[PDB]
From Swiss-Prot:
Tissues in which the protein is found: Brain, heart, placenta, pancreas and skeletal muscle. Expressed to a lesser extent in lung, liver and kidney.
Activity modulation comment: Activated by cell stresses such as DNA damage, heat shock, osmotic shock, anisomycin and sodium arsenite, as well as pro-inflammatory stimuli such as bacterial lipopolysaccharide (LPS) and interleukin-1.
Residues noted as binding ATP in the record, renumbered to the chain: K44
Protein family per UniProt: Belongs to the protein kinase superfamily. CMGC Ser/Thr protein kinase family. MAP kinase subfamily.
Single GO MF annotation: NFAT protein binding
Protein name (database record): Mitogen-activated protein kinase 14
Cofactor(s) for this UniProt protein: Mg(2+)
Gene: MAPK14
A GO term from the CC aspect: nucleus
Pfam families documented for this protein: Pkinase (PF00069)
Keyword Thylakoid: no
Result, substituting A42V: In a gastric adenocarcinoma sample; somatic mutation
Free-text note regarding domains: The TXY motif contains the threonine and tyrosine residues whose phosphorylation activates the MAP kinases.
The protein's assembly and partners: Component of a signaling complex containing at least AKAP13, PKN1, MAPK14, ZAK and MAP2K3. Within this complex, AKAP13 interacts directly with PKN1, which in turn recruits MAPK14, MAP2K3 and ZAK. Binds to a kinase interaction motif within the protein tyrosine phosphatase, PTPRR. This interaction retains MAPK14 in the cytoplasm and prevents nuclear accumulation. Interacts with SPAG9 and GADD45A. Interacts with CDC25B, CDC25C, DUSP1, DUSP10, DUSP16, NP60, SUPT20H and TAB1. Interacts with casein kinase II subunits CSNK2A1 and CSNK2B. Interacts with PPM1D.
Length: 330
């Protein structure tokens, strides 16, 4: 039924969680120990979940996403609770997931990694991306800071499908008509940073970002230019002077030739010609880890709520229904 909640203030806010979650420490997200399972968990308290319609919709969206995903390389909902015992008093939402311990930015420390650690880290990203994309969901903001990694170099993806600031890993079509391969471009930027130890495109603005991107992959041809309707976007690409496409063998010299070939297939300007997650998993670069019978897909995700403009109270009760109906995973 109902458990005992205790209150404790951290990060200048008051946390109220069941007694089964002990030793809360901030990392708004806290690290905590679940005395029921013996697991170290990550606890997230949603900030002002129903302050506005946008906040209420995003609160509902985040809860719907976590309840759907059941994948090894995708963060999932272990528990969700609220101290309120009625809908009217409902104004707090807590999310409990696995605690990996660090992000990809922390464990990398801006250092070069072996080709095999790169193989393993990138394989988990694509393996989880395939599951996410099979549910018809785009991450849109894949970056090292939302890739949770433990001391075993195991990886889970965070914050997928949440976003609708520096954008070093955003596909060049989001800045400046796009599909799921916008996440594949982010994987290429991440994989390039793991191999060489520097940010591939350290842009200072959206135009400086574009200049660094075009300098590597080259100025587009007519078959790509004819698919851009934005007269401003077509201007920036062409008004930026002619730039020959770099040799990826020279940009990533010393790296595994199979790694360079995969990067050329990921960092394609034309998103219509960009490799997908499933095709990337079948690339020869992942020969040591690829198994088609262990790269499962997801059930269909009901996304129709995204196209609805509802009041705050409606998004709140829908969120409330999802909290009461939650069943913990095995
Ligand atoms: C608690 C929580 C709740 C929801 C979401 C989430 O991803 N929300 C989504 C997903 C799709 O849409 N919205 C993420 C977390 C979470 C945050 N940080 C975590 C973590 C889990 N596990 C970790 O190890 N860490 C760090 C090491 C501290 C990085």
């Amino acid at each position: 039924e109902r458990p005992t909640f205790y209150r404790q203030e951290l990060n200048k806010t008051i946390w109220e969680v069941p007694e089964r979650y002990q030793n809360l420490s901030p990392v708004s997200v806290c690290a905590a120990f679940d005395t029921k399972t013996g697991l170290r968990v990550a606890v997230k308290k949603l900030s002002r979940p129903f302050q506005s319609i946008i906040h209420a919709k995003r609160t509902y969206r985040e809860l719907r996403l976590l309840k759907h995903m059941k994948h090894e390389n995708v963060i999932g909902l272990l528990d969700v609770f609220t101290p309120a015992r009625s809908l009217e008093e409902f104004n707090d939402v807590y999310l409990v997931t696995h605690l990996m311990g660090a992000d990809l930015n922390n464990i990398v420390k801006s250092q070069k990694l072996t080709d095999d650690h790169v193989q393993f880290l990138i394989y988990q990203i694509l393996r989880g991306l395939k599951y996410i994309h099979s549910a018809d969901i785009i991450h849109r903001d894949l970056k090292p800071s939302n890739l949770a990694v433990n001391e075993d170099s195991e990886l889970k993806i965070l914050d997928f499908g949440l976003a609708r600031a520096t954008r070093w890993y955003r596909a060049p079509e989001i800045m400046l008509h796009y599909n799921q391969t916008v996440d594949i471009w982010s994987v290429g930027c991440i994989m390039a940073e793991l191999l060489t130890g520097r940010t591939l495109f350290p842009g200072t603005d959206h135009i400086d970002q574009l200049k660094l991107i075009l300098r590597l992959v080259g100025t587009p041809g007519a078959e790509l230019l004819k698919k851009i309707s934005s007269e401003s976007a077509r201007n920036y690409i062409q008004s930026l002077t002619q730039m020959p496409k770099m040799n990826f063998a020279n940009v990533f010299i010393g790296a595994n030739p199979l790694a360079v070939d995969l990067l050329e297939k990921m960092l394609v300007l034309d998103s219509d010609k960009r490799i997908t997650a499933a095709q990337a998993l079948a690339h020869a670069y992942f020969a040591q880890y690829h198994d088609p019978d262990d790269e499962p897909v997801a059930d269909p995700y009901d996304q129709s709520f995204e196209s609805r403009d509802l009041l705050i109270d409606e998004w709140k009760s829908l969120t409330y229904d999802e909290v009461i109906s939650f069943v913990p995973p095995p």
